[PDB]
Design a protein around this ligand. Sequence first.
Ligand SMILES: *[C@@H]1O[C@H](CO)[C@@H](O[C@@H]2O[C@H](CO)[C@@H](O)[C@H](O)[C@H]2NC(C)=O)[C@H](O)[C@H]1NC(C)=O
Ligand SMILES: *[C@@H]1O[C@H](CO)[C@@H](O[C@@H]2O[C@H](CO)[C@@H](O)[C@H](O)[C@H]2NC(C)=O)[C@H](O)[C@H]1NC(C)=O
Ligand SMILES: *[C@@H]1O[C@H](CO)[C@@H](O[C@@H]2O[C@H](CO)[C@@H](O)[C@H](O)[C@H]2NC(C)=O)[C@H](O)[C@H]1NC(C)=O
Ligand SMILES: *[C@@H]1O[C@H](CO)[C@@H](O[C@@H]2O[C@H](CO)[C@@H](O)[C@H](O)[C@H]2NC(C)=O)[C@H](O)[C@H]1NC(C)=O
Ligand SMILES: *[C@@H]1O[C@H](CO)[C@@H](O[C@@H]2O[C@H](CO)[C@@H](O)[C@H](O)[C@H]2NC(C)=O)[C@H](O)[C@H]1NC(C)=O
Ligand SMILES: *[C@@H]1O[C@H](CO)[C@@H](O[C@@H]2O[C@H](CO)[C@@H](O)[C@H](O)[C@H]2NC(C)=O)[C@H](O)[C@H]1NC(C)=O
Ligand SMILES: *[C@@H]1O[C@H](CO)[C@@H](O[C@@H]2O[C@H](CO)[C@@H](O)[C@H](O)[C@H]2NC(C)=O)[C@H](O)[C@H]1NC(C)=O
Ligand code: NAG
Ligand code: NAG
Lengths: 50, 702, 96
Amino acid sequence: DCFSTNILTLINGFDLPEGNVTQENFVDMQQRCNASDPAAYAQLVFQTCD
Amino acid sequence: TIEEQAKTFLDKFNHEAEDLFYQSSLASWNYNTNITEENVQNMNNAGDKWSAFLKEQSTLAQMYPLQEIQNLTVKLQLQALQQNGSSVLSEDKSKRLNTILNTMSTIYSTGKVCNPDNPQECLLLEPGLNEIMANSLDYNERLWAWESWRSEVGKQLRPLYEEYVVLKNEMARANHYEDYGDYWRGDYEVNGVDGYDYSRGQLIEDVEHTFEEIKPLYEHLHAYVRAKLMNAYPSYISPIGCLPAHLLGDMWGRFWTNLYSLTVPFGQKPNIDVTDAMVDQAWDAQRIFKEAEKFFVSVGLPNMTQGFWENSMLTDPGNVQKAVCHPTAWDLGKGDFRILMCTKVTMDDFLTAHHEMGHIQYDMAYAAQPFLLRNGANEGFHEAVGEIMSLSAATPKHLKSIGLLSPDFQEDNETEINFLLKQALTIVGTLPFTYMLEKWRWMVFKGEIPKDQWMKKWWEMKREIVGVVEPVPHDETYCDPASLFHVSNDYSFIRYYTRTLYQFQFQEALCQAAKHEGPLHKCDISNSTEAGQKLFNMLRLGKSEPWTLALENVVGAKNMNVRPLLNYFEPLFTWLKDQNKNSFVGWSTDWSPYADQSIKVRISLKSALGDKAYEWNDNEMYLFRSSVAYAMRQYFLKVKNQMILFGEEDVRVANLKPRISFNFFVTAPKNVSDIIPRTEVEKAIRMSRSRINDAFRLNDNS
Amino acid sequence: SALGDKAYEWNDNEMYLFRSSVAYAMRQYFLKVKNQMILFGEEDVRVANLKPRISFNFFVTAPKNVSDIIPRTEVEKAIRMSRSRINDAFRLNDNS
Ligand SMILES: *[C@@H]1O[C@H](CO)[C@@H](O[C@@H]2O[C@H](CO)[C@@H](O)[C@H](O)[C@H]2NC(C)=O)[C@H](O)[C@H]1NC(C)=O
Ligand SMILES: *[C@@H]1O[C@H](CO)[C@@H](O[C@@H]2O[C@H](CO)[C@@H](O)[C@H](O)[C@H]2NC(C)=O)[C@H](O)[C@H]1NC(C)=O
Ligand SMILES: *[C@@H]1O[C@H](CO)[C@@H](O[C@@H]2O[C@H](CO)[C@@H](O)[C@H](O)[C@H]2NC(C)=O)[C@H](O)[C@H]1NC(C)=O
Ligand SMILES: *[C@@H]1O[C@H](CO)[C@@H](O[C@@H]2O[C@H](CO)[C@@H](O)[C@H](O)[C@H]2NC(C)=O)[C@H](O)[C@H]1NC(C)=O
Ligand SMILES: *[C@@H]1O[C@H](CO)[C@@H](O[C@@H]2O[C@H](CO)[C@@H](O)[C@H](O)[C@H]2NC(C)=O)[C@H](O)[C@H]1NC(C)=O
Ligand SMILES: *[C@@H]1O[C@H](CO)[C@@H](O[C@@H]2O[C@H](CO)[C@@H](O)[C@H](O)[C@H]2NC(C)=O)[C@H](O)[C@H]1NC(C)=O
Ligand SMILES: *[C@@H]1O[C@H](CO)[C@@H](O[C@@H]2O[C@H](CO)[C@@H](O)[C@H](O)[C@H]2NC(C)=O)[C@H](O)[C@H]1NC(C)=O
Ligand SMILES: *[C@@H]1O[C@H](CO)[C@@H](O)[C@H](O)[C@H]1NC(C)=O
Ligand SMILES: *[C@@H]1O[C@H](CO)[C@@H](O)[C@H](O)[C@H]1NC(C)=O
């Protein structure tokens, strides 16, 4: 549930299609998102869960 | 080889073309000075005879090569006659393009909009709508006119424009050109000279470079105008946002001149007005032409031929004959030139006389050149000469010299600031618009912009480059740029950029030849033999040589420059910088006039339905708009006890995203200026949310 | 019958919603089968013979052509395709 919350936060932040990000393609899409539009991702509060 | 019969054919063609061009020019002049239908066909078939030479051009496309013509003049004439134009297209496609162009012109010329409450009388564009957009100070009337003209004319003109761009791209590609934009840019292309070359693509970047030196000054002007509008329409413009598009003095925003009455730096002291003194001197509308000709010859220009004085349409007789007298310098040729311009007693006509006589002086200076080379260097020089002539003839010292503007008057600098701002509202308010429009057209022809993102890119560039925001969202069914005269009627728009620069360069160099001391805008040209010789060392060149050489012969530069314009407007720049201590110079590209009352919607189909979830297309958007209209109807009926006919056209939607998230707002049925406040929309959604949800198979979280 | 208690009243706004639903169904059928995009509206759905039983006749026309009537077979096919959505928009199920 924590991972799902993180995915939802990113999706709502950058308005990507709902089914594009998943459990395993999260880090690369996160990197792509900060590279594309910096200084707007910084407003997001990301929590870590392992 | 060959050169021998090439020349011989050029000579024979010139001999057989000059006379019929002369006859056609006489026929057109007689049509224009006296509107009679009986001779219209008499000249129409005459034009057909000139079209005969078109088929003669077919005789120079097969056996005449290109690389073997080493000489310059014969090559220039040959390539000026070699082009096939639109003839390479098939007959069916050619007639399709012709009927498309005619349909677009007719739609623009005879379009009508009218009131939502009295639909019995409608308004055209040229009278009525233009007066509303120029004179009215009402927010609602201006918004209605802007949005209504957009809706009707753009929605009619979109698909014709799509077919037009497809066909024109095909025709240009089949004519050894990359695209149609390349065909348009080919006017400036110069090659085969080894040192003065100018590529078609290079022009693009040059234009961009020039705009980089304009963005500061314009920005300040923009900010100033914003402040002066905040008093006219309070609570409508954000101090840190862009200007609304319908408040800019006219329908499209090409010029900000009509804002002058609202944005006078010092309204207590008026500027120069001399028509009262001109009337007091009681001068007929004949002596001003003689005085202007004397001023023209004082700088060393050749005397004007007697034929212009003997036969011309100078002043309207005032009899039962009613013919249009729009200003025009007719150059029928062979020493026969005329002026067609109705003369009144104003400053405007007095300066238009100088403009037209500069035009004809340019045109007659190079009469010795061949007929095919009897044109200006490019599209920008011909109007630039007239512009510099009128600018030089409008100085207050000139009025003092010519006997007007009585000496008992001190030239205070506040009136100079007023004049500078009035000039800036015209010259500087149009460069971003021209640049953005030509950029949009170039990228549309190039294929960079897909057919489903024309309006998106249009309004993005509008908000980013010009700092102007639309008052209502416009989807892909609109064709706003096609509502311009120059876009629907297939005309080029880049000239108004380059000319606007060229003239100023000239206005420096010539006025430098007169050894000016003070500011540039106060300098004069009259009685400058060196300046006249320098100008004539370009006037007689014509099209025989590349325009770079002609430009260098005057300013010593190989391209267009922006510095003289900034030196022209430096005093106004200093004043504006002084006057904007508190204002936020710049604009933000996120504020919208409708963004306060919008509601955002986010939809998650995959979470709610998982498998067997439907796709989201424009039909689902239609259903959502219908549902919101139903909710608003029910709320207004069951609470406020009023019956209002909301539709799916009253729900305006913006910012659609692949996440399925968008903003929307609601307006009154037949009134675009009336927006339902967000609280009422929230109440209606609260009332009907269960039905809105179950129409789409989603439940309050998706 | 379907809702029993807490059943809503039927006014002209419900007729507007029904016309919008039928227009949506016709749009979807024409887009997804005949490969044409036609802009049907609620003004193209003509309704007659409204009764207190809530029974009425309707037909459909082309968007800007009153002389063009979609034949009953195409309307039947479109209703068959979109009947589930038409039903669940109104809280009724294939028998009410
Ligand atoms: C997202 O971008 C920010 C930029 O603000 C990244 O941070 C900076 O990365 C550089 C390394 O090149 C560091 O020196 C800075 O200290 C970082 N912080 C700044 C400039 O504020 C940040 O790492 C990215 N977010 C992630 C994925 O951690
Ligand atoms: C426009 O100008 C006058 C209108 O006053 C017209 O001139 C006619 O010209 C012919 C040739 O002299 C005369 O025979 C007629 O009597 C004139 N009057 C008529 C018939 O209008 C004419 O309308 C125009 N002039 C032209 C075409 O040359
Ligand atoms: C190229 O052809 C031009 C004409 O198109 C030639 O120019 C003529 O040159 C002769 C002698 O140099 C002069 O008498 C003429 O006045 C020139 N122009 C006319 C009216 O034909 C020229 O000879 C050729 N090449 C050059 C040197 O320009
Ligand atoms: C302008 O039109 C001519 C003829 O209308 C075109 O010439 C054709 O050129 C091609 C390739 O050399 C030949 O194979 C054809 O036989 C020529 N004529 C035909 C039948 O089209 C040419 O497209 C144009 N010429 C230039 C210089 O643009
Ligand atoms: C242009 O005109 C204004 C106002 O006339 C001048 O502003 C000066 O400001 C100082 C400080 O208050 C005052 O002496 C006057 O308001 C103005 N002085 C004079 C001599 O006009 C401004 O200096 C003028 N700029 C010029 C002539 O270049
Ligand atoms: C510029 O040319 C004009 C043409 O003569 C000159 O203007 C005249 O100058 C005399 C000299 O006192 C005045 O009395 C006349 O009234 C002027 N003419 C008019 C129509 O007003 C002027 O002198 C010339 N400038 C130069 C370089 O001498
Ligand atoms: C409106 O609909 C009618 C019939 O659907 C159209 O009339 C037909 O037009 C076609 C093509 O011109 C003819 O072949 C038929 O004979 C016409 N009649 C019928 C009954 O089919 C009419 O063209 C449509 N009008 C518009 C503007 O689309
Ligand atoms: C999912 O991510 C890829 C790469 O970023 C990109 O194609 C797009 O954002 C998404 N894919 C599709 C087909 O939309
Ligand atoms: C030009 O022609 C007119 C004829 O009226 C003459 O008066 C004038 O002196 C001429 N201009 C000159 C010689 O500069």
